[PDB]
Every structure is written in C-alpha cells, then in structure tokens.
Design an enzyme around this catalytic site. Structure first.
Site, PDB file in Angstrom:
ATOM      1  N   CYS A 114      -3.117  -2.925  -2.941  1.00 60.17           N
ATOM      2  CA  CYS A 114      -4.217  -2.819  -2.000  1.00 60.17           C
ATOM      3  C   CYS A 114      -5.450  -2.352  -2.767  1.00 60.17           C
ATOM      4  CB  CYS A 114      -3.883  -1.802  -0.912  1.00 60.17           C
ATOM      5  SG  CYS A 114      -5.277  -1.454   0.169  1.00 60.17           S
ATOM      6  N   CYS A 142      -6.211   1.831  -1.452  1.00 59.64           N
ATOM      7  CA  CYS A 142      -5.377   2.980  -1.750  1.00 59.64           C
ATOM      8  C   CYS A 142      -4.819   2.995  -3.174  1.00 59.64           C
ATOM      9  CB  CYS A 142      -4.233   3.067  -0.734  1.00 59.64           C
ATOM     10  SG  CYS A 142      -3.158   1.606  -0.612  1.00 59.64           S
ATOM     11  N   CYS A 174       0.804  -1.218   0.000  1.00 54.69           N
ATOM     12  CA  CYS A 174       0.000   0.000   0.000  1.00 54.69           C
ATOM     13  C   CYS A 174       0.835   1.265   0.000  1.00 54.69           C
ATOM     14  CB  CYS A 174      -0.866   0.082   1.258  1.00 54.69           C
ATOM     15  SG  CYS A 174      -1.970  -1.261   1.589  1.00 54.69           S
TER      16      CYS A 174
END
Ligand SMILES: [Zn+2]
Length: 132
Positions: free
Chosen positions: A63, A66, A32
């Site tokens: 992810c 994000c 992320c």
DNA sequence: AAATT
DNA sequence: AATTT
DNA sequence: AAAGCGCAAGAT
DNA sequence: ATCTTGCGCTTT
C-alpha cells in the site's frame, strides 16, 4: 489465532497489530498493515499473510499509505532523535530546519517526535546542554 | 491522493 | 464512476 | 531572526 | 477521513 480475530484487529485499525501480520485485498492486489487508514474492503475479499515477504510472493504490492513492506518505524525514528541530540550539543545554535535537513525529517515531524521522545523541544535541549 | 467498492 | 479514509 | 502556536489550507 | 504543511501572530 484465527483470521476472524485478525479481522477484528483490522476493522479496529489496531496499531498493536502492525507487524504481527499483513492483510491483502484480492480486488486491488494491494496489502496493508492492520492500522491502515484506507477504507476497508469486504471481508470476503481479504486474506492474511504473516508478513510482507509472503504477500509479495503471492502477487500483492504494498500500500502507498501505510508502507507495509518496511519494518516498524519505532527504532528508525528513535535513531533519528538520538542523532539530533548529538548535533545539538554545541554552543552555536542549530535551527530546526538545519536539524531537520540533517536527520532527514520534515521539520514538523522532527519537532513533534523530539518533544515526544526527549520531553523538550530541540531548542531547549541545546539550551540545556549549554546550561550544564 | 489512494484504496476499495 | 463514486465512495471513503 | 527563529521558536511556538492555533487554525486554514493542501495532500494522501 | 485523516494527517501534513503553510500562515499570521506572539513569545523567545
Ligand atoms: Zn495501506
């Protein structure tokens, strides 16, 4: 800089850090951006990569919250407004919905970003154009 | 819901 | 399976 | 009829 | 926990 400093950026969920690097969690195989809203992992499970590419290369998938595989939205969003400004430069009224459809943004985001970038609502912008 | 424990 | 954002 | 606005409700 | 969308109400 060292990874501990990078770690502090992550615990701080500092947006200023996004783009600078990406972190990965071995227990999840996900990576992320430093400002990801997801609960944090244990330091001992985290590792850092200078960018997505390298992360993928290492077997980590992005992810779903994000989107660390896509570049900084900054410009993308800016491109959106500009186009909206041009579509509004006409006498015939354009509704936020028709506009949102066109720039491809939820009417909520478009309206919030527009007033954030231009300083007024799409409606006002169209009225101002008519005005002058 | 999705990440992480 | 339970927590945490 | 559509824009705005505050808050409930839904989604991630 | 945090952010987005849906709603009812007032203002354009
Ligand atoms: Zn993330």
């Amino acid at each position: 800089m060292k990874d501990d400093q990078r770690w502090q950026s992550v615990l701080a969920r500092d947006p200023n850090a996004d783009g600078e690097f990406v972190f990965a969690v071995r227990t999840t195989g996900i990576f992320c951006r430093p400002s990801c809203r997801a609960r944090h992992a244990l330091r001992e499970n985290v590792s850092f990569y200078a960018n997505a590419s390298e992360a993928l290369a290492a077997g980590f998938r992005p992810c779903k919250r994000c989107q660390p595989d896509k570049a900084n939205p900054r410009q993308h969003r800016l491109d959106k407004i500009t186009h909206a400004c041009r579509l509004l430069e006409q006498e015939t009224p354009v509704t936020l919905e028709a506009l949102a459809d066109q720039v491809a943004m939820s009417p909520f985001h478009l309206h919030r970003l527009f007033k954030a970038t231009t300083g007024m609502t799409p409606k006002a912008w169209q009225q101002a154009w008519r005005a002058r």
